[PDB]
Amino acid sequence: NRFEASLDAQDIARISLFTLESGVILRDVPVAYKSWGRMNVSRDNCVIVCHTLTSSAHVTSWWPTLFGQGRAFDTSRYFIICLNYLGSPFGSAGPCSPDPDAERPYGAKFPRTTIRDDVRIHRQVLDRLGVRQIAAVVGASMGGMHTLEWAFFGPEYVRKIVPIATSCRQSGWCAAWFETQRQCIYDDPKYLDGEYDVDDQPVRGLETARKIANLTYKSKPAMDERFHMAPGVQPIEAVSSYLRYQAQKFAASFDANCYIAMTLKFDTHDISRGRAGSIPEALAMITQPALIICARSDGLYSFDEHVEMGRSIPNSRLCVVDTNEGHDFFVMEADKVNDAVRGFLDQ
Amino acid sequence: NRFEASLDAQDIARISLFTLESGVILRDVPVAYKSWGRMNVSRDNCVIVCHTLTSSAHVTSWWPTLFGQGRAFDTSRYFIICLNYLGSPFGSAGPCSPDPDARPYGAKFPRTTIRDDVRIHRQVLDRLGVRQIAAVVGASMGGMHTLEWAFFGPEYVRKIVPIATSCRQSGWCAAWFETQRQCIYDDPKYLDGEYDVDDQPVRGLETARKIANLTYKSKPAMDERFHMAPGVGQPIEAVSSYLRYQAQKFAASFDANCYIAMTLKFDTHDISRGRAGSIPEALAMITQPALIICARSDGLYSFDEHVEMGRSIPNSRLCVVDTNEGHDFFVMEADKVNDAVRGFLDQ
Ligand SMILES: CC(C)(COP(=O)(O)OP(=O)(O)OC[C@H]1O[C@@H](n2cnc3c(N)ncnc32)[C@H](O)[C@@H]1OP(=O)(O)O)[C@@H](O)C(=O)NCCC(=O)NCCS
Numbered sequence: 001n002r003f004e005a006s007l008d009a010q011d012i013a014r015i016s017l018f019t020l021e022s023g024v025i026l027r028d029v030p031v032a033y034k035s036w037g038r039m040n041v042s043r044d045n046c047v048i049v050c051h052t053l054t055s056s057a058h059v060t061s062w063w064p065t066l067f068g069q070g071r072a073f074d075t076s077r078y079f080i081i082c083l084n085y086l087g088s089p090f091g092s093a094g095p096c097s098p099d100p101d102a103e104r105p106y107g108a109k110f111p112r113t114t115i116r117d118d119v120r121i122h123r124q125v126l127d128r129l130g131v132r133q134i135a136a137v138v139g140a141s142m143g144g145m146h147t148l149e150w151a152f153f154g155p156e157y158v159r160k161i162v163p164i165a166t167s168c169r170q171s172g173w174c175a176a177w178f179e180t181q182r183q184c185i186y187d188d189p190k191y192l193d194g195e196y197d198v199d200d201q202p203v204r205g206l207e208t209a210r211k212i213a214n215l216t217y218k219s220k221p222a223m224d225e226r227f228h229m230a231p232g233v234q235p236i237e238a239v240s241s242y243l244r245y246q247a248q249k250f251a252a253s254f255d256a257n258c259y260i261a262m263t264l265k266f267d268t269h270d271i272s273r274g275r276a277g278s279i280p281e282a283l284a285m286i287t288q289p290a291l292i293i294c295a296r297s298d299g300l301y302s303f304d305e306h307v308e309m310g311r312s313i314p315n316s317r318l319c320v321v322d323t324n325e326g327h328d329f330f331v332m333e334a335d336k337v338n339d340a341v342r343g344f345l346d347q
Numbered sequence: 348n349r350f351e352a353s354l355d356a357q358d359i360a361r362i363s364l365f366t367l368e369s370g371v372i373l374r375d376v377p378v379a380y381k382s383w384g385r386m387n388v389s390r391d392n393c394v395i396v397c398h399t400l401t402s403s404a405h406v407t408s409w410w411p412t413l414f415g416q417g418r419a420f421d422t423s424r425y426f427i428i429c430l431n432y433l434g435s436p437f438g439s440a441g442p443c444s445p446d447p448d449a450r451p452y453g454a455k456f457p458r459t460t461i462r463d464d465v466r467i468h469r470q471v472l473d474r475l476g477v478r479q480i481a482a483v484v485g486a487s488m489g490g491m492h493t494l495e496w497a498f499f500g501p502e503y504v505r506k507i508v509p510i511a512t513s514c515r516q517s518g519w520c521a522a523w524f525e526t527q528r529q530c531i532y533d534d535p536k537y538l539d540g541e542y543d544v545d546d547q548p549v550r551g552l553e554t555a556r557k558i559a560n561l562t563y564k565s566k567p568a569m570d571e572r573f574h575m576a577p578g579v580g581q582p583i584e585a586v587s588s589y590l591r592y593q594a595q596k597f598a599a600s601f602d603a604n605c606y607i608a609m610t611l612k613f614d615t616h617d618i619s620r621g622r623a624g625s626i627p628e629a630l631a632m633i634t635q636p637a638l639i640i641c642a643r644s645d646g647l648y649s650f651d652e653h654v655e656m657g658r659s660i661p662n663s664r665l666c667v668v669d670t671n672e673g674h675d676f677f678v679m680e681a682d683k684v685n686d687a688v689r690g691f692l693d694q
């Protein structure tokens with residue numbers, strides 16, 4: 001696994017048997033994680049960070065300014081931990097990890113997993129480490145979906161949540177964007193039904209999926225600032241090169257089967273399913289204090305759906321970041337996100 | 348030319364020599380057009396309709412309800428005309444048309460601008476005896492032509508109705524359309540534009556259209572079309588089929604080289620170039636009454652940029668259509684577009 005090899009040092013917990021909510025049983029299941037700081041003696045100063053679609057558990061690599069003394073992820077006050085999702089190439093069980101029933105990696109045969117599956121197996125790891133109580137869960141985008149699912153363990157185990165730039169269930173809009181991206185992979189002749197050699201990826205498929213995803217992550221004003229025409233009496237011609245560079249970078253560093261496995265998780269996200277008759281009714285069962293962070297310019301997760309979260313979670317506050325960055329704001333405006341999270345954790 | 352062969356009957360004007368603003372000279376140039384109604388004695392009841400990227404000059408095929416007695420394009424009051432852009436497969440000179448110096452132009456059709464189209468179109472109108480234009484109306488790409496028509500001045504062009512469009516290329520649209528072109532460039536059937544016309548880069552065209560289609564919608568419109576079941580096509584699973592159907596339909600009925608040639612026109616659009624030091628200054632030179640029609644939910648051409656048009660064009664009125672449809676609204680809300688256009692022409 002060249003993806004996992006590329007990472008800084010991390011830990012692996014092995015779960016000998018895990019039942020997915022489908023009923024499919026995974027065996028000898030690795031769960032990768034990275035932690036910072038130290039548990040207090042009550043073992044109740046744990047902060048869980050949930051990562052994004054294509055990142056590893058090493059949150060420091062894209063959120064470096066949220067770590068350290070006086071920052072949100074203050075390793076002098078908290079045990080901070082991030083666990084790699086199932087389906088990911090970065091250490092946890094997925095397409096790139098060894099298949100116990102032949103060992104050969106799972107490849108295209110890695111079972112479907114849900115947001116709820118990840119939350120369940122991640123909690124088993126926290127129980128192994130001796131975590132007694134979680135001070136906060138914080139996650140953006142896909143990680144905000146896990147965050148909302150963590151909340152349902154209840155306020156005695158999970159004290160606070162910070163869902164950022166996210167949704168309560170799959171929407172037709174995001175389903176269509178992500179399926180379009182998968183079809184790019186499916187249509188690449190190198191894909192070979194998922195049977196490709198790991199070093200001969202469907203690179204055109206991955207590249208095109210990235211170009212699309214990148215634009216859905218930005219906004220019109222953000223792209224207009226980056227590329228514009230000269231006054232009538234950074235240039236538009238540069239767009240081509242920018243797109244090719246962004247795409248190639250992603251295609252060299254991610255696995256196609258994993259990209260399929262992980263985006264498919266989006267389609268089964270729904271905090272209400274089996275629990276409540278509607279989204280507002282499921283939200284009402286979230287009893288912890290919540291800080292909901294969003295931007296009006298996010299083109300995938302709307303301002304309105306964050307307002308709906310705020311209306312139905314009884315003890316919630318909505319933080320609207322003033323920015324034109326689009327969905328990518330939680331990384332671009334990391335200082336503002338840091339201050340918001342730190343101020344909420346301090347309360 | 349199988350694309351041109353598929354159309355209802357239309358007229359062709361032949362321009363023996365045309366100088367593109369690049370300085371490249373086109374020879375023996377067909378310009379296709381379709382008209383409805385009859386000129387009055389003064390030859391001053393001309394209404395120009397400017398078409399969209401992948402349509403022909405036959406406006407009735409996608410705007411059928413704007414035509415007829417008491418409608419916007421009232422063929423009892425006006426001579427309505429639409430001319431096919433250069434670069435299109437539908438009759439005007441383009442990649443599919445005969446190369447007078449050879450075989451069709453193919454990949455070697457010279458670059459053309461919005462301004463080139465307007466120029467050669469006015470030459471045709473002069474041949475037809477049009478003395479004055481009562482209004483020009485166009486949406487999206489056609490709105491760009493519409494703004495360029497206005498520069499002939501208020502004596503030749505009496506009114507303009509730009510819809511869902513821009514004053515110049517933006518980094519946002521340039522990135523979306525360049526991404527779509529790369530899909531075609533990266534299809535192995537593309538062969539640098541030297542493909543056989545009946546062996547198109549179909550995968551590239553399909554993927555280009557899936558992407559375009561979604562940029563033409565909005566989150567609310569897709570979320571109405573496709574959604575999950577309540578907690579305890581229209582299901583999310585039907586998205587796949589929907590995307591494949593849309594894409595294939597387009598790939599069967601358009602030419603890859605022409606897609607390239609036409610989208611590239613977007614990049615050189617700028618009503619201020621050679622004319623003014625800024626967009627607001629160029630807009631201030633538009634002295635005709637203007638009706639600007641837009642939807643807030645348009646993901647490609649922003650509400651704000653239409654508000655800018657309304658602020659700088661001295662005699663303008665902004666019409667905001669109440670709709671959740673996205674860029675596609677001008678076709679989906681045709682009745683509201685009709686009524687706005689007719690009301691303005693009645694003034
Ligand atoms: C990290 C990230 C936030 C950077 O955002 P950004 O600063 O706005 O980046 P830009 O869009 O402006 O592009 C800059 C990159 O392209 C490059 N670039 C710019 N113009 C270029 C050109 N003309 N030719 C080639 N490269 C160019 C720059 O070198 C830069 O690359 P680098 O960061 O590797 O050095 C974003 O690129 C990313 O990696 N992912 C965002 C999505 C995400 O993190 N979430 C995952 C799922 S939500």
Ligand SMILES: CC(C)(COP(=O)(O)OP(=O)(O)OC[C@H]1O[C@@H](n2cnc3c(N)ncnc32)[C@H](O)[C@@H]1OP(=O)(O)O)[C@@H](O)C(=O)NCCC(=O)NCCS
Pocket residue numbers: 399400401402487563572580581585586588589592593674675678679
């Ligand atoms: C004509 C148009 C406006 C229709 O918009 P719409 O009503 O929103 O269409 P939808 O997105 O809801 O989809 C409807 C079509 O998809 C099909 N469809 C829907 N669900 C499907 C599924 N699950 N499987 C297969 N097909 C499906 C429907 O049968 C219908 O087909 P038909 O139009 O051939 O009868 C649009 O598709 C279009 O081509 N215009 C875009 C604007 C444009 O091209 N202008 C140029 C630049 S703006």
